Amino acid sequence: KIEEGKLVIWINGDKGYNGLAEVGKKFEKDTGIKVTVEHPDKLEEKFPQVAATGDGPDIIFWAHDRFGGYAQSGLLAEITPDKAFQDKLYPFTWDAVRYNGKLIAYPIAVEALSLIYNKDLLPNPPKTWEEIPALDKELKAKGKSALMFNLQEPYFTWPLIAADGGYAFKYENGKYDIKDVGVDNAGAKAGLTFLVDLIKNKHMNADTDYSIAEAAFNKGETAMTINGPWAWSNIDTSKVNYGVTVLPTFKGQPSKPFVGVLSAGINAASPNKELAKEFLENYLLTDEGLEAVNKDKPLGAVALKSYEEELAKDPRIAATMENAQKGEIMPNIPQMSAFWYAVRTAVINAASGRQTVDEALKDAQTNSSSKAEKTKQGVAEAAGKTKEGVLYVGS
Numbered sequence: 001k002i003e004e005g006k007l008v009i010w011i012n013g014d015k016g017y018n019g020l021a022e023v024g025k026k027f028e029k030d031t032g033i034k035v036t037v038e039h040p041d042k043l044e045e046k047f048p049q050v051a052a053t054g055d056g057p058d059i060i061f062w063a064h065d066r067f068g069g070y071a072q073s074g075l076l077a078e079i080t081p082d083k084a085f086q087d088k089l090y091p092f093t094w095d096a097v098r099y100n101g102k103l104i105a106y107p108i109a110v111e112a113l114s115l116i117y118n119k120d121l122l123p124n125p126p127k128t129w130e131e132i133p134a135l136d137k138e139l140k141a142k143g144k145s146a147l148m149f150n151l152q153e154p155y156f157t158w159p160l161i162a163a164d165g166g167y168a169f170k171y172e173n174g175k176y177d178i179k180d181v182g183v184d185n186a187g188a189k190a191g192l193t194f195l196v197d198l199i200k201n202k203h204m205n206a207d208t209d210y211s212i213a214e215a216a217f218n219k220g221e222t223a224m225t226i227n228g229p230w231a232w233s234n235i236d237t238s239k240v241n242y243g244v245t246v247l248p249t250f251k252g253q254p255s256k257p258f259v260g261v262l263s264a265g266i267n268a269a270s271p272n273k274e275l276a277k278e279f280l281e282n283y284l285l286t287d288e289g290l291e292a293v294n295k296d297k298p299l300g301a302v303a304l305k306s307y308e309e310e311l312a313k314d315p316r317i318a319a320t321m322e323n324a325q326k327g328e329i330m331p332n333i334p335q336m337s338a339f340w341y342a343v344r345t346a347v348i349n350a351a352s353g354r355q356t357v358d359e360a361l362k363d364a365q366t367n368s369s370s371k372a373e374k375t376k377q378g379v380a381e382a383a384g385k386t387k388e389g390v391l392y393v394g395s
């Protein structure tokens with residue numbers, strides 16, 4: 001079971017887990033309650049499997065889009081912040097963590113992708129996706145490339161898919177309609193086709209992942225990348241002279257990144273819900289707590305009004321918020337896991353040439369709109385049926 005009287009926290013390995021551990025250590029010094037921060041791989045897939053049995057961490061950090069599914073499954077606790085606490089965070093961030101009328105996590109920070117570029121290689125970054133091939137040809141003549149970003153997670157390609165009309169779920173008459181999906185409309189197809197054409201024409205490689213893109217950009221080998229605020233820390237260390245700015249347009253339309261609110265959910269099986277509330281409200285969601293995490297890896301535009309008033313002065317946060325305004329806050333509905341798996345499969349398959357864009361996105365539409373020792377006992381029932389009446393075992 002989960003251990004009473006301590007806290008275990010999971011957070012993704014791209015975030016400021018060392019800074020979060022500093023907050024945990026302060027909490028322990030003050031209250032005697034040990035706090036252990038972990039960053040497992042694939043935590044967003046591990047959590048629902050282990051929480052189903054009452055195991056897992058006390059607190060899970062992820063963007064809010066996964067949390068409605070966890071809540072529907074009974075894996076996240078309703079939280080109980082009072083009115084004065086709620087007043088400390090922006091109303092729109094509370095909206096992101098509301099599911100079936102209930103608050104099911106504490107919002108931490110607003111994440112949007114931006115275009116990150118090397119000012120020495122590219123003092124003037126491209127306004128449009130369309131001009132990137134010509135820019136790549138120029139840079140290749142100098143032993144560089146124009147653009148590298150993670151092609152294994154559809155989060156990074158979504159802004160281009162959505163630019164000219166792609167969408168996840170239609171919102172109408174007060175709700176998201178899971179039978180009205182926008183992953184295979186003309187705009188979505190156009191965006192993915194453009195990415196695939198970049199690859200076919202050798203301006204990008206289908207196998208490029210988070211680490212490959214980050215290494216290339218930070219080594220000064222590629223002029224641009226697409227990433228979130230957490231990435232800025234390593235670029236600071238790299239000493240690349242970088243800027244953070246608005247994503248390129250496609251067909252003249254803004255790229256529309258899906259915006260995530262990094263949020264802290266409490267395991268519904270935790271015996272430490274009160275401890276988790278104290279930690280999150282009175283240690284983490286304070287200027288000093290968020291600063292500790294932010295100094296490790298930038299959070300983005302934080303949900304905490306007092307600290308955001310400081311971070312807002314950062315032009316990189318200004319760029320983050322411009323991209324956020326052009327994009328959309330993700331739904332939190334349970335169907336989001338199906339949507340993301342479907343689009344992940346489509347992007348990887350189209351990029352690698354395993355499927356055409358039309359084939360891949362048709363499949364994504366179908367799966368996106370398809371609604372998302374018990375074993376020992378079932379085997380036993382089936383065995384018992386073979387022994388009913390005068391039936392016998394064995395010949």
Ligand SMILES: OC[C@H]1O[C@H](O[C@H]2[C@H](O)[C@@H](O)[C@@H](O)O[C@@H]2CO)[C@H](O)[C@@H](O)[C@@H]1O
Pocket residue numbers: 012014044062063064065066111153154155156260262340
């Ligand atoms: O690629 C699909 C993936 O997108 C989002 O995950 C982001 C996450 O929001 C960020 O915090 C950061 O970790 O990068 C991830 C992309 O690799 C969704 O939140 C996630 O549910 C979805 O599977």
